[PDB]
Amino acid sequence: FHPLLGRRVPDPAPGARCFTGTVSSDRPAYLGEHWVYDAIVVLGVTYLEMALAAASRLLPGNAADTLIVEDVTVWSPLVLRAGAPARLRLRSEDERFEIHSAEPERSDDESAWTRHATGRIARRQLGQLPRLDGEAVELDAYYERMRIYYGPRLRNIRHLERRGREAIGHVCLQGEEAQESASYELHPALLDACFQCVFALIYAHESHREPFVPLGCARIELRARGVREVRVHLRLHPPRSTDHNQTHTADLRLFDMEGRLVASVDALQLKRAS
Ligand SMILES: [Mg+2]
């Protein structure tokens, strides 16, 4: 019933919760539109959405309470072969979750599951967009350079301006992805677009070969569900090198078009893929 979580199955053991489903590069379609080294690689934002969705369904609270994911680590990428289904599983005990995948033919052998992401979930009962006066980032040149990594469903930044290591971007879903607001807590395409604003700032100064990949996130909090359009403020932490870096860290704040805070991301940790 969630496009990535699948369905909740009976608790495998007392106090242990579990969701399982099947995905492929064709469904959700955006899972087939991100590549690294010519392999289809599931975007890390997929795991953040699964965790937010699990928080909403497992943890108590008013519907309007904020959804929280903390201490996220991405352990192993999920590589899809075009059109071949993969079993996905999110398991939870207490506040901690794990996301694994398996070949459907081997999904009953517990040792056939590869761990992709882990963290903690929480729920809590319920800053402004700066006037940056930035320099416009030319997005067409960015998209054309990044098209070896990203397909046309994942080019959702409309405007981006920078000043120092900060930027404000306007991201808006379109096409099928804008029609799916009822399906996700925060559409992976929208959050990926916000993270790509960080990429656009980085790649002004260093190469997009061996591209940066999200490996961790200290905290993400979501205050409104089903958002299709935001302005995002991002701040890159001071880099270790002015030439070429293996890692970056960024904080982000997402606002609706009225300036109300929709989501906040603390210490997104990026590392170049080997
Ligand atoms: Mg990724």
UniProtKB/TrEMBL annotation:
<feature type="active site" description="Proton donor; for dehydratase activity">
    <location>
        <position position="192"/>
    </location>
</feature>
<comment type="function">
    <text>Involved in production of the polyketide antibiotic thailandamide.</text>
</comment>
<feature type="region of interest" description="N-terminal hotdog fold">
    <location>
        <begin position="2"/>
        <end position="126"/>
    </location>
</feature>
<feature type="domain" description="PKS/mFAS DH">
    <location>
        <begin position="2"/>
        <end position="274"/>
    </location>
</feature>
<protein>
    <submittedName>
        <fullName>GphF</fullName>
    </submittedName>
</protein>
<feature type="region of interest" description="C-terminal hotdog fold">
    <location>
        <begin position="134"/>
        <end position="274"/>
    </location>
</feature>
<feature type="active site" description="Proton acceptor; for dehydratase activity">
    <location>
        <position position="34"/>
    </location>
</feature>
